[PDB]
Amino acid sequence: NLYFQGMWKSISQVLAEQFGAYYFIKHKEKLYSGEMNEIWLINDEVQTVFVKINERSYRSMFRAEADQLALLAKTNSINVPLVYGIGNSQGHSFLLLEALNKSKNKQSSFTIFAEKIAQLHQIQGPDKYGLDFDTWLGPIYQPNDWQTSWAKFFSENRIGWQLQICKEKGLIFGNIDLIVQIVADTLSKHNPKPSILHGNLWIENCIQVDDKIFVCNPACYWGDRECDIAFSSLFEPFPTNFYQRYNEIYPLEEGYLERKLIYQLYYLLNFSYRYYNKKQSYVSLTQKLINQILHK
């Protein structure tokens, strides 16, 4: 595997610049992933590194992921893994992160996490929705061109965008314009304070590390804080104390339950696209949810 050897050399080089001394790789282990990316753990007998790998052209995505972890770390709110760097080789690109030690879950760690998620959403920034660069949610990038209207931004850059991607794979749920317009009507009078979103907030991206929860795989943008909350309760939800404490610090506004459905629809379309060949319950839930929004 000639190109694979070049890849390890480039990783050693990026790690050398980072730590100051050259990084001699002594052990390497490939972890399982359903995802597009290959995942590895490597170490030099002292420092362990978590490595995401893909083809060379994915360097831009890995760059975006690193910039998100950086901007999230700078808010001094949620716990995110450190970035050691990005890079590429002849046939691969990669992201290099802190290897977090996963310990047994503590329900109480979610009370503190809700305080950090709250703090994150309370940060005042721009008066428009989006971000300076396009972020990714699974294998699809999210258009983040700035918009003053949330109705428009979510309707087209989220729902419409994902519906089109699904259509290309043959996942057809209904007339796309109709769905976009219905979602736009619901958000018609809703232009909330833009909040910096983790963007991929659900249980599988949380990791218990000693007494704190860390969160990974961001899909950031400035949007409605409710999208984060909505997604976290879609599948296996966070425990009860999270929602209790979050609502106590930053009370959710009137209209939340109606909006929760269209916010959740975005993730189901994404999941449907990513896993139609494997799970199959994602399509069924998406179709049922679309019928509710469209018929009733």
Side-chain angles (χ1 to χ4, degrees), residues 201-226:
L201 192 66
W202 76 297
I203 203 59
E204 286 197 359
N205 296 334
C206 296
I207 307 175
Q208 184 79 43
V209 190
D210 299 18
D211 202 10
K212 307 176 304 318
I213 292 289
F214 271 74
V215 69
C216 316
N217 308 321
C220 309
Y221 67 108
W222 286 91
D224 188 352
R225 59 197 184 92
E226 296 177 13

mmCIF file with all atom_site columns, all heavy atoms in Angstrom, residues 201-226:
data_model
loop_
_atom_site.group_PDB
_atom_site.id
_atom_site.type_symbol
_atom_site.label_atom_id
_atom_site.label_alt_id
_atom_site.label_comp_id
_atom_site.label_asym_id
_atom_site.label_entity_id
_atom_site.label_seq_id
_atom_site.pdbx_PDB_ins_code
_atom_site.Cartn_x
_atom_site.Cartn_y
_atom_site.Cartn_z
_atom_site.occupancy
_atom_site.B_iso_or_equiv
_atom_site.pdbx_formal_charge
_atom_site.auth_seq_id
_atom_site.auth_comp_id
_atom_site.auth_asym_id
_atom_site.auth_atom_id
_atom_site.pdbx_PDB_model_num
ATOM 1   N N   . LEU A 1 201 ? -25.829 18.104 17.374 1.00 0.00 ? 201 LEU A N   1
ATOM 2   C CA  . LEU A 1 201 ? -25.980 17.788 18.789 1.00 0.00 ? 201 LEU A CA  1
ATOM 3   C C   . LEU A 1 201 ? -26.916 16.626 19.090 1.00 0.00 ? 201 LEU A C   1
ATOM 4   O O   . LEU A 1 201 ? -28.135 16.797 19.171 1.00 0.00 ? 201 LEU A O   1
ATOM 5   C CB  . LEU A 1 201 ? -26.451 19.035 19.542 1.00 0.00 ? 201 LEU A CB  1
ATOM 6   C CG  . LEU A 1 201 ? -26.407 19.003 21.062 1.00 0.00 ? 201 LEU A CG  1
ATOM 7   C CD1 . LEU A 1 201 ? -24.962 18.925 21.582 1.00 0.00 ? 201 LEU A CD1 1
ATOM 8   C CD2 . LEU A 1 201 ? -27.085 20.244 21.584 1.00 0.00 ? 201 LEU A CD2 1
ATOM 9   N N   . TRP A 1 202 ? -26.342 15.438 19.218 1.00 0.00 ? 202 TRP A N   1
ATOM 10  C CA  . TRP A 1 202 ? -27.098 14.288 19.657 1.00 0.00 ? 202 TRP A CA  1
ATOM 11  C C   . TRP A 1 202 ? -26.181 13.318 20.378 1.00 0.00 ? 202 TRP A C   1
ATOM 12  O O   . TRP A 1 202 ? -24.954 13.402 20.266 1.00 0.00 ? 202 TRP A O   1
ATOM 13  C CB  . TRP A 1 202 ? -27.865 13.632 18.523 1.00 0.00 ? 202 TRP A CB  1
ATOM 14  C CG  . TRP A 1 202 ? -27.133 12.801 17.568 1.00 0.00 ? 202 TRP A CG  1
ATOM 15  C CD1 . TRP A 1 202 ? -26.148 13.193 16.722 1.00 0.00 ? 202 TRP A CD1 1
ATOM 16  C CD2 . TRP A 1 202 ? -27.424 11.440 17.244 1.00 0.00 ? 202 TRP A CD2 1
ATOM 17  N NE1 . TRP A 1 202 ? -25.771 12.144 15.910 1.00 0.00 ? 202 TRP A NE1 1
ATOM 18  C CE2 . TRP A 1 202 ? -26.541 11.056 16.215 1.00 0.00 ? 202 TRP A CE2 1
ATOM 19  C CE3 . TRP A 1 202 ? -28.331 10.505 17.734 1.00 0.00 ? 202 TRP A CE3 1
ATOM 20  C CZ2 . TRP A 1 202 ? -26.545 9.789  15.675 1.00 0.00 ? 202 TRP A CZ2 1
ATOM 21  C CZ3 . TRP A 1 202 ? -28.329 9.253  17.205 1.00 0.00 ? 202 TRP A CZ3 1
ATOM 22  C CH2 . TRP A 1 202 ? -27.447 8.901  16.181 1.00 0.00 ? 202 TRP A CH2 1
ATOM 23  N N   . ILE A 1 203 ? -26.800 12.395 21.100 1.00 0.00 ? 203 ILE A N   1
ATOM 24  C CA  . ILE A 1 203 ? -26.091 11.499 21.999 1.00 0.00 ? 203 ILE A CA  1
ATOM 25  C C   . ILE A 1 203 ? -24.850 10.801 21.410 1.00 0.00 ? 203 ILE A C   1
ATOM 26  O O   . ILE A 1 203 ? -23.842 10.692 22.096 1.00 0.00 ? 203 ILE A O   1
ATOM 27  C CB  . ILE A 1 203 ? -27.061 10.456 22.638 1.00 0.00 ? 203 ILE A CB  1
ATOM 28  C CG1 . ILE A 1 203 ? -26.493 9.914  23.955 1.00 0.00 ? 203 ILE A CG1 1
ATOM 29  C CG2 . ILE A 1 203 ? -27.379 9.349  21.642 1.00 0.00 ? 203 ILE A CG2 1
ATOM 30  C CD1 . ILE A 1 203 ? -26.226 11.001 25.010 1.00 0.00 ? 203 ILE A CD1 1
ATOM 31  N N   . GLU A 1 204 ? -24.899 10.371 20.154 1.00 0.00 ? 204 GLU A N   1
ATOM 32  C CA  . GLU A 1 204 ? -23.734 9.697  19.571 1.00 0.00 ? 204 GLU A CA  1
ATOM 33  C C   . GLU A 1 204 ? -22.482 10.583 19.446 1.00 0.00 ? 204 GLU A C   1
ATOM 34  O O   . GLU A 1 204 ? -21.387 10.048 19.371 1.00 0.00 ? 204 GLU A O   1
ATOM 35  C CB  . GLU A 1 204 ? -24.057 9.000  18.241 1.00 0.00 ? 204 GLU A CB  1
ATOM 36  C CG  . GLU A 1 204 ? -24.882 7.700  18.432 1.00 0.00 ? 204 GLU A CG  1
ATOM 37  C CD  . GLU A 1 204 ? -24.880 6.777  17.201 1.00 0.00 ? 204 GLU A CD  1
ATOM 38  O OE1 . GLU A 1 204 ? -24.268 7.128  16.167 1.00 0.00 ? 204 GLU A OE1 1
ATOM 39  O OE2 . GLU A 1 204 ? -25.492 5.689  17.271 1.00 0.00 ? 204 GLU A OE2 1
ATOM 40  N N   . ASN A 1 205 ? -22.639 11.906 19.432 1.00 0.00 ? 205 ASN A N   1
ATOM 41  C CA  . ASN A 1 205 ? -21.506 12.808 19.385 1.00 0.00 ? 205 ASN A CA  1
ATOM 42  C C   . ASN A 1 205 ? -21.124 13.314 20.771 1.00 0.00 ? 205 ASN A C   1
ATOM 43  O O   . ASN A 1 205 ? -20.401 14.292 20.895 1.00 0.00 ? 205 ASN A O   1
ATOM 44  C CB  . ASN A 1 205 ? -21.775 13.994 18.446 1.00 0.00 ? 205 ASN A CB  1
ATOM 45  C CG  . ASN A 1 205 ? -21.955 13.566 17.015 1.00 0.00 ? 205 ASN A CG  1
ATOM 46  O OD1 . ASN A 1 205 ? -21.451 12.546 16.608 1.00 0.00 ? 205 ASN A OD1 1
ATOM 47  N ND2 . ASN A 1 205 ? -22.678 14.358 16.240 1.00 0.00 ? 205 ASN A ND2 1
ATOM 48  N N   . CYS A 1 206 ? -21.616 12.688 21.823 1.00 0.00 ? 206 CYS A N   1
ATOM 49  C CA  . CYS A 1 206 ? -21.180 13.084 23.151 1.00 0.00 ? 206 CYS A CA  1
ATOM 50  C C   . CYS A 1 206 ? -20.236 12.018 23.649 1.00 0.00 ? 206 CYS A C   1
ATOM 51  O O   . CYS A 1 206 ? -20.326 10.878 23.233 1.00 0.00 ? 206 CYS A O   1
ATOM 52  C CB  . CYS A 1 206 ? -22.348 13.276 24.098 1.00 0.00 ? 206 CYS A CB  1
ATOM 53  S SG  . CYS A 1 206 ? -23.406 14.618 23.582 1.00 0.00 ? 206 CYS A SG  1
ATOM 54  N N   . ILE A 1 207 ? -19.285 12.414 24.482 1.00 0.00 ? 207 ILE A N   1
ATOM 55  C CA  . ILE A 1 207 ? -18.338 11.482 25.078 1.00 0.00 ? 207 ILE A CA  1
ATOM 56  C C   . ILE A 1 207 ? -18.099 11.918 26.495 1.00 0.00 ? 207 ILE A C   1
ATOM 57  O O   . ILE A 1 207 ? -17.741 13.072 26.744 1.00 0.00 ? 207 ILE A O   1
ATOM 58  C CB  . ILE A 1 207 ? -16.953 11.443 24.398 1.00 0.00 ? 207 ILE A CB  1
ATOM 59  C CG1 . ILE A 1 207 ? -17.064 11.209 22.886 1.00 0.00 ? 207 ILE A CG1 1
ATOM 60  C CG2 . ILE A 1 207 ? -16.108 10.316 25.031 1.00 0.00 ? 207 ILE A CG2 1
ATOM 61  C CD1 . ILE A 1 207 ? -15.694 11.284 22.139 1.00 0.00 ? 207 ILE A CD1 1
ATOM 62  N N   . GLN A 1 208 ? -18.321 10.986 27.417 1.00 0.00 ? 208 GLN A N   1
ATOM 63  C CA  . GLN A 1 208 ? -18.070 11.215 28.821 1.00 0.00 ? 208 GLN A CA  1
ATOM 64  C C   . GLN A 1 208 ? -16.559 11.045 29.060 1.00 0.00 ? 208 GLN A C   1
ATOM 65  O O   . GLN A 1 208 ? -15.993 9.964  28.784 1.00 0.00 ? 208 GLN A O   1
ATOM 66  C CB  . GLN A 1 208 ? -18.837 10.180 29.651 1.00 0.00 ? 208 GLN A CB  1
ATOM 67  C CG  . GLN A 1 208 ? -18.736 10.366 31.143 1.00 0.00 ? 208 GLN A CG  1
ATOM 68  C CD  . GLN A 1 208 ? -19.654 11.442 31.667 1.00 0.00 ? 208 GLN A CD  1
ATOM 69  O OE1 . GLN A 1 208 ? -20.816 11.538 31.261 1.00 0.00 ? 208 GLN A OE1 1
ATOM 70  N NE2 . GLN A 1 208 ? -19.158 12.229 32.619 1.00 0.00 ? 208 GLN A NE2 1
ATOM 71  N N   . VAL A 1 209 ? -15.917 12.101 29.563 1.00 0.00 ? 209 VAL A N   1
ATOM 72  C CA  . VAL A 1 209 ? -14.482 12.074 29.904 1.00 0.00 ? 209 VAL A CA  1
ATOM 73  C C   . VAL A 1 209 ? -14.322 12.535 31.342 1.00 0.00 ? 209 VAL A C   1
ATOM 74  O O   . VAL A 1 209 ? -14.387 13.729 31.641 1.00 0.00 ? 209 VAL A O   1
ATOM 75  C CB  . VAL A 1 209 ? -13.684 12.979 28.993 1.00 0.00 ? 209 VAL A CB  1
ATOM 76  C CG1 . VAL A 1 209 ? -12.180 12.732 29.226 1.00 0.00 ? 209 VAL A CG1 1
ATOM 77  C CG2 . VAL A 1 209 ? -14.088 12.709 27.545 1.00 0.00 ? 209 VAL A CG2 1
ATOM 78  N N   . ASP A 1 210 ? -14.114 11.565 32.225 1.00 0.00 ? 210 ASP A N   1
ATOM 79  C CA  . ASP A 1 210 ? -14.068 11.809 33.658 1.00 0.00 ? 210 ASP A CA  1
ATOM 80  C C   . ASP A 1 210 ? -15.383 12.491 34.107 1.00 0.00 ? 210 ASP A C   1
ATOM 81  O O   . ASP A 1 210 ? -16.428 11.886 33.935 1.00 0.00 ? 210 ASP A O   1
ATOM 82  C CB  . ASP A 1 210 ? -12.780 12.549 34.062 1.00 0.00 ? 210 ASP A CB  1
ATOM 83  C CG  . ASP A 1 210 ? -11.521 11.746 33.734 1.00 0.00 ? 210 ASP A CG  1
ATOM 84  O OD1 . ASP A 1 210 ? -11.600 10.804 32.906 1.00 0.00 ? 210 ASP A OD1 1
ATOM 85  O OD2 . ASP A 1 210 ? -10.448 12.053 34.305 1.00 0.00 ? 210 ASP A OD2 1
ATOM 86  N N   . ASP A 1 211 ? -15.360 13.727 34.610 1.00 0.00 ? 211 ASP A N   1
ATOM 87  C CA  . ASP A 1 211 ? -16.579 14.367 35.115 1.00 0.00 ? 211 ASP A CA  1
ATOM 88  C C   . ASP A 1 211 ? -17.262 15.328 34.119 1.00 0.00 ? 211 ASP A C   1
ATOM 89  O O   . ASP A 1 211 ? -18.159 16.075 34.495 1.00 0.00 ? 211 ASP A O   1
ATOM 90  C CB  . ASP A 1 211 ? -16.242 15.127 36.412 1.00 0.00 ? 211 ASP A CB  1
ATOM 91  C CG  . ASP A 1 211 ? -17.478 15.378 37.319 1.00 0.00 ? 211 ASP A CG  1
ATOM 92  O OD1 . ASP A 1 211 ? -18.570 14.809 37.064 1.00 0.00 ? 211 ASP A OD1 1
ATOM 93  O OD2 . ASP A 1 211 ? -17.353 16.139 38.314 1.00 0.00 ? 211 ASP A OD2 1
ATOM 94  N N   . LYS A 1 212 ? -16.869 15.304 32.851 1.00 0.00 ? 212 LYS A N   1
ATOM 95  C CA  . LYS A 1 212 ? -17.416 16.230 31.875 1.00 0.00 ? 212 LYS A CA  1
ATOM 96  C C   . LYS A 1 212 ? -17.812 15.529 30.582 1.00 0.00 ? 212 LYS A C   1
ATOM 97  O O   . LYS A 1 212 ? -17.250 14.489 30.221 1.00 0.00 ? 212 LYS A O   1
ATOM 98  C CB  . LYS A 1 212 ? -16.362 17.278 31.514 1.00 0.00 ? 212 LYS A CB  1
ATOM 99  C CG  . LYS A 1 212 ? -15.737 18.025 32.682 1.00 0.00 ? 212 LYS A CG  1
ATOM 100 C CD  . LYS A 1 212 ? -14.623 18.999 32.240 1.00 0.00 ? 212 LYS A CD  1
ATOM 101 C CE  . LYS A 1 212 ? -13.503 18.309 31.430 1.00 0.00 ? 212 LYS A CE  1
ATOM 102 N NZ  . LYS A 1 212 ? -13.032 16.939 31.949 1.00 0.00 ? 212 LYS A NZ  1
ATOM 103 N N   . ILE A 1 213 ? -18.785 16.123 29.896 1.00 0.00 ? 213 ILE A N   1
ATOM 104 C CA  . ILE A 1 213 ? -19.212 15.673 28.583 1.00 0.00 ? 213 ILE A CA  1
ATOM 105 C C   . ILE A 1 213 ? -18.429 16.490 27.538 1.00 0.00 ? 213 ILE A C   1
ATOM 106 O O   . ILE A 1 213 ? -18.280 17.710 27.656 1.00 0.00 ? 213 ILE A O   1
ATOM 107 C CB  . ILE A 1 213 ? -20.734 15.891 28.359 1.00 0.00 ? 213 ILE A CB  1
ATOM 108 C CG1 . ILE A 1 213 ? -21.575 14.964 29.260 1.00 0.00 ? 213 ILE A CG1 1
ATOM 109 C CG2 . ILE A 1 213 ? -21.122 15.626 26.901 1.00 0.00 ? 213 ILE A CG2 1
ATOM 110 C CD1 . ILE A 1 213 ? -21.518 13.475 28.854 1.00 0.00 ? 213 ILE A CD1 1
ATOM 111 N N   . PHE A 1 214 ? -17.892 15.795 26.549 1.00 0.00 ? 214 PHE A N   1
ATOM 112 C CA  . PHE A 1 214 ? -17.221 16.432 25.417 1.00 0.00 ? 214 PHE A CA  1
ATOM 113 C C   . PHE A 1 214 ? -18.112 16.181 24.212 1.00 0.00 ? 214 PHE A C   1
ATOM 114 O O   . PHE A 1 214 ? -18.771 15.123 24.150 1.00 0.00 ? 214 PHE A O   1
ATOM 115 C CB  . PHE A 1 214 ? -15.849 15.799 25.150 1.00 0.00 ? 214 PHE A CB  1
ATOM 116 C CG  . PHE A 1 214 ? -14.727 16.429 25.913 1.00 0.00 ? 214 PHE A CG  1
ATOM 117 C CD1 . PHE A 1 214 ? -14.579 16.204 27.270 1.00 0.00 ? 214 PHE A CD1 1
ATOM 118 C CD2 . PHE A 1 214 ? -13.798 17.225 25.263 1.00 0.00 ? 214 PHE A CD2 1
ATOM 119 C CE1 . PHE A 1 214 ? -13.543 16.784 27.981 1.00 0.00 ? 214 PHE A CE1 1
ATOM 120 C CE2 . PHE A 1 214 ? -12.764 17.806 25.966 1.00 0.00 ? 214 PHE A CE2 1
ATOM 121 C CZ  . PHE A 1 214 ? -12.637 17.582 27.332 1.00 0.00 ? 214 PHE A CZ  1
ATOM 122 N N   . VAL A 1 215 ? -18.136 17.113 23.258 1.00 0.00 ? 215 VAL A N   1
ATOM 123 C CA  . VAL A 1 215 ? -18.944 16.907 22.043 1.00 0.00 ? 215 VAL A CA  1
ATOM 124 C C   . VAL A 1 215 ? -18.061 17.044 20.797 1.00 0.00 ? 215 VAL A C   1
ATOM 125 O O   . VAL A 1 215 ? -17.219 17.930 20.749 1.00 0.00 ? 215 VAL A O   1
ATOM 126 C CB  . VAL A 1 215 ? -20.189 17.840 22.024 1.00 0.00 ? 215 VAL A CB  1
ATOM 127 C CG1 . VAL A 1 215 ? -19.778 19.289 21.830 1.00 0.00 ? 215 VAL A CG1 1
ATOM 128 C CG2 . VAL A 1 215 ? -21.165 17.374 20.969 1.00 0.00 ? 215 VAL A CG2 1
ATOM 129 N N   . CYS A 1 216 ? -18.265 16.159 19.819 1.00 0.00 ? 216 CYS A N   1
ATOM 130 C CA  . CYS A 1 216 ? -17.477 16.044 18.573 1.00 0.00 ? 216 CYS A CA  1
ATOM 131 C C   . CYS A 1 216 ? -18.317 16.246 17.305 1.00 0.00 ? 216 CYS A C   1
ATOM 132 O O   . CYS A 1 216 ? -19.524 16.468 17.385 1.00 0.00 ? 216 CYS A O   1
ATOM 133 C CB  . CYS A 1 216 ? -16.948 14.604 18.442 1.00 0.00 ? 216 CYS A CB  1
ATOM 134 S SG  . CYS A 1 216 ? -16.282 13.920 19.948 1.00 0.00 ? 216 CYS A SG  1
ATOM 135 N N   . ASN A 1 217 ? -17.656 16.101 16.148 1.00 0.00 ? 217 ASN A N   1
ATOM 136 C CA  . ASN A 1 217 ? -18.263 16.162 14.810 1.00 0.00 ? 217 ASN A CA  1
ATOM 137 C C   . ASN A 1 217 ? -19.234 17.332 14.566 1.00 0.00 ? 217 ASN A C   1
ATOM 138 O O   . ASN A 1 217 ? -20.368 17.132 14.170 1.00 0.00 ? 217 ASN A O   1
ATOM 139 C CB  . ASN A 1 217 ? -18.945 14.820 14.512 1.00 0.00 ? 217 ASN A CB  1
ATOM 140 C CG  . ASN A 1 217 ? -18.007 13.624 14.735 1.00 0.00 ? 217 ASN A CG  1
ATOM 141 O OD1 . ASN A 1 217 ? -16.823 13.681 14.409 1.00 0.00 ? 217 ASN A OD1 1
ATOM 142 N ND2 . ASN A 1 217 ? -18.538 12.540 15.294 1.00 0.00 ? 217 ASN A ND2 1
ATOM 143 N N   . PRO A 1 218 ? -18.781 18.564 14.792 1.00 0.00 ? 218 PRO A N   1
ATOM 144 C CA  . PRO A 1 218 ? -19.637 19.735 14.597 1.00 0.00 ? 218 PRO A CA  1
ATOM 145 C C   . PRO A 1 218 ? -20.125 19.991 13.151 1.00 0.00 ? 218 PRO A C   1
ATOM 146 O O   . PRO A 1 218 ? -19.566 19.474 12.183 1.00 0.00 ? 218 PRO A O   1
ATOM 147 C CB  . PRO A 1 218 ? -18.767 20.883 15.096 1.00 0.00 ? 218 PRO A CB  1
ATOM 148 C CG  . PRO A 1 218 ? -17.396 20.399 14.902 1.00 0.00 ? 218 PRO A CG  1
ATOM 149 C CD  . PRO A 1 218 ? -17.394 18.950 15.102 1.00 0.00 ? 218 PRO A CD  1
ATOM 150 N N   . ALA A 1 219 ? -21.228 20.729 13.051 1.00 0.00 ? 219 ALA A N   1
ATOM 151 C CA  . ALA A 1 219 ? -21.813 21.131 11.767 1.00 0.00 ? 219 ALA A CA  1
ATOM 152 C C   . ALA A 1 219 ? -22.302 22.552 11.974 1.00 0.00 ? 219 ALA A C   1
ATOM 153 O O   . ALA A 1 219 ? -23.436 22.889 11.628 1.00 0.00 ? 219 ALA A O   1
ATOM 154 C CB  . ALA A 1 219 ? -22.948 20.219 11.380 1.00 0.00 ? 219 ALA A CB  1
ATOM 155 N N   . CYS A 1 220 ? -21.422 23.388 12.526 1.00 0.00 ? 220 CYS A N   1
ATOM 156 C CA  . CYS A 1 220 ? -21.771 24.732 12.918 1.00 0.00 ? 220 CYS A CA  1
ATOM 157 C C   . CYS A 1 220 ? -22.365 25.680 11.872 1.00 0.00 ? 220 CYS A C   1
ATOM 158 O O   . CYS A 1 220 ? -22.191 25.522 10.660 1.00 0.00 ? 220 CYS A O   1
ATOM 159 C CB  . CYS A 1 220 ? -20.546 25.440 13.509 1.00 0.00 ? 220 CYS A CB  1
ATOM 160 S SG  . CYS A 1 220 ? -19.658 24.551 14.819 1.00 0.00 ? 220 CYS A SG  1
ATOM 161 N N   . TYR A 1 221 ? -23.061 26.667 12.430 1.00 0.00 ? 221 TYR A N   1
ATOM 162 C CA  . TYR A 1 221 ? -23.605 27.808 11.745 1.00 0.00 ? 221 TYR A CA  1
ATOM 163 C C   . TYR A 1 221 ? -24.375 28.620 12.750 1.00 0.00 ? 221 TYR A C   1
ATOM 164 O O   . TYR A 1 221 ? -24.687 28.136 13.839 1.00 0.00 ? 221 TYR A O   1
ATOM 165 C CB  . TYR A 1 221 ? -24.506 27.481 10.551 1.00 0.00 ? 221 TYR A CB  1
ATOM 166 C CG  . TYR A 1 221 ? -25.830 26.799 10.791 1.00 0.00 ? 221 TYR A CG  1
ATOM 167 C CD1 . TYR A 1 221 ? -27.034 27.506 10.651 1.00 0.00 ? 221 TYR A CD1 1
ATOM 168 C CD2 . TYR A 1 221 ? -25.901 25.420 11.032 1.00 0.00 ? 221 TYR A CD2 1
ATOM 169 C CE1 . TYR A 1 221 ? -28.283 26.861 10.805 1.00 0.00 ? 221 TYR A CE1 1
ATOM 170 C CE2 . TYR A 1 221 ? -27.130 24.772 11.178 1.00 0.00 ? 221 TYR A CE2 1
ATOM 171 C CZ  . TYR A 1 221 ? -28.312 25.502 11.050 1.00 0.00 ? 221 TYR A CZ  1
ATOM 172 O OH  . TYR A 1 221 ? -29.522 24.868 11.195 1.00 0.00 ? 221 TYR A OH  1
ATOM 173 N N   . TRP A 1 222 ? -24.636 29.868 12.376 1.00 0.00 ? 222 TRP A N   1
ATOM 174 C CA  . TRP A 1 222 ? -25.411 30.779 13.188 1.00 0.00 ? 222 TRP A CA  1
ATOM 175 C C   . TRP A 1 222 ? -26.877 30.587 12.751 1.00 0.00 ? 222 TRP A C   1
ATOM 176 O O   . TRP A 1 222 ? -27.248 30.885 11.605 1.00 0.00 ? 222 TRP A O   1
ATOM 177 C CB  . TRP A 1 222 ? -24.944 32.239 12.999 1.00 0.00 ? 222 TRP A CB  1
ATOM 178 C CG  . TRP A 1 222 ? -23.648 32.594 13.632 1.00 0.00 ? 222 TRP A CG  1
ATOM 179 C CD1 . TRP A 1 222 ? -22.417 32.517 13.069 1.00 0.00 ? 222 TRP A CD1 1
ATOM 180 C CD2 . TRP A 1 222 ? -23.445 33.117 14.962 1.00 0.00 ? 222 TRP A CD2 1
ATOM 181 N NE1 . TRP A 1 222 ? -21.468 32.956 13.951 1.00 0.00 ? 222 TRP A NE1 1
ATOM 182 C CE2 . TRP A 1 222 ? -22.066 33.317 15.124 1.00 0.00 ? 222 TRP A CE2 1
ATOM 183 C CE3 . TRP A 1 222 ? -24.293 33.433 16.019 1.00 0.00 ? 222 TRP A CE3 1
ATOM 184 C CZ2 . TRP A 1 222 ? -21.511 33.819 16.305 1.00 0.00 ? 222 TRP A CZ2 1
ATOM 185 C CZ3 . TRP A 1 222 ? -23.740 33.940 17.197 1.00 0.00 ? 222 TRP A CZ3 1
ATOM 186 C CH2 . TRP A 1 222 ? -22.366 34.122 17.331 1.00 0.00 ? 222 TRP A CH2 1
ATOM 187 N N   . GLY A 1 223 ? -27.700 30.061 13.658 1.00 0.00 ? 223 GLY A N   1
ATOM 188 C CA  . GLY A 1 223 ? -29.131 29.786 13.361 1.00 0.00 ? 223 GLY A CA  1
ATOM 189 C C   . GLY A 1 223 ? -30.015 29.892 14.603 1.00 0.00 ? 223 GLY A C   1
ATOM 190 O O   . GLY A 1 223 ? -29.698 30.647 15.532 1.00 0.00 ? 223 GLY A O   1
ATOM 191 N N   . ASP A 1 224 ? -31.138 29.164 14.592 1.00 0.00 ? 224 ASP A N   1
ATOM 192 C CA  . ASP A 1 224 ? -32.071 29.110 15.727 1.00 0.00 ? 224 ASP A CA  1
ATOM 193 C C   . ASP A 1 224 ? -31.524 28.050 16.696 1.00 0.00 ? 224 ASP A C   1
ATOM 194 O O   . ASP A 1 224 ? -31.311 26.883 16.314 1.00 0.00 ? 224 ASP A O   1
ATOM 195 C CB  . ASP A 1 224 ? -33.501 28.754 15.257 1.00 0.00 ? 224 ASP A CB  1
ATOM 196 C CG  . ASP A 1 224 ? -34.578 28.881 16.366 1.00 0.00 ? 224 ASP A CG  1
ATOM 197 O OD1 . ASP A 1 224 ? -34.269 29.089 17.559 1.00 0.00 ? 224 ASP A OD1 1
ATOM 198 O OD2 . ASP A 1 224 ? -35.775 28.784 16.026 1.00 0.00 ? 224 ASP A OD2 1
ATOM 199 N N   . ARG A 1 225 ? -31.272 28.478 17.929 1.00 0.00 ? 225 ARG A N   1
ATOM 200 C CA  . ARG A 1 225 ? -30.803 27.579 18.987 1.00 0.00 ? 225 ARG A CA  1
ATOM 201 C C   . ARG A 1 225 ? -31.640 26.318 19.109 1.00 0.00 ? 225 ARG A C   1
ATOM 202 O O   . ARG A 1 225 ? -31.116 25.271 19.472 1.00 0.00 ? 225 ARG A O   1
ATOM 203 C CB  . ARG A 1 225 ? -30.780 28.295 20.328 1.00 0.00 ? 225 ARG A CB  1
ATOM 204 C CG  . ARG A 1 225 ? -32.116 28.847 20.806 1.00 0.00 ? 225 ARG A CG  1
ATOM 205 C CD  . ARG A 1 225 ? -31.848 29.859 21.896 1.00 0.00 ? 225 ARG A CD  1
ATOM 206 N NE  . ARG A 1 225 ? -33.043 30.409 22.524 1.00 0.00 ? 225 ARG A NE  1
ATOM 207 C CZ  . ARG A 1 225 ? -33.641 29.928 23.617 1.00 0.00 ? 225 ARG A CZ  1
ATOM 208 N NH1 . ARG A 1 225 ? -33.206 28.827 24.228 1.00 0.00 ? 225 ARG A NH1 1
ATOM 209 N NH2 . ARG A 1 225 ? -34.716 30.547 24.100 1.00 0.00 ? 225 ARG A NH2 1
ATOM 210 N N   . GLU A 1 226 ? -32.929 26.432 18.767 1.00 0.00 ? 226 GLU A N   1
ATOM 211 C CA  . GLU A 1 226 ? -33.896 25.347 18.868 1.00 0.00 ? 226 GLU A CA  1
ATOM 212 C C   . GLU A 1 226 ? -33.565 24.151 17.992 1.00 0.00 ? 226 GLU A C   1
ATOM 213 O O   . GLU A 1 226 ? -34.032 23.051 18.274 1.00 0.00 ? 226 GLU A O   1
ATOM 214 C CB  . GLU A 1 226 ? -35.314 25.875 18.556 1.00 0.00 ? 226 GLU A CB  1
ATOM 215 C CG  . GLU A 1 226 ? -35.826 26.923 19.561 1.00 0.00 ? 226 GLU A CG  1
ATOM 216 C CD  . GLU A 1 226 ? -37.182 27.504 19.211 1.00 0.00 ? 226 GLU A CD  1
ATOM 217 O OE1 . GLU A 1 226 ? -37.878 26.946 18.330 1.00 0.00 ? 226 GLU A OE1 1
ATOM 218 O OE2 . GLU A 1 226 ? -37.566 28.530 19.831 1.00 0.00 ? 226 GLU A OE2 1
#
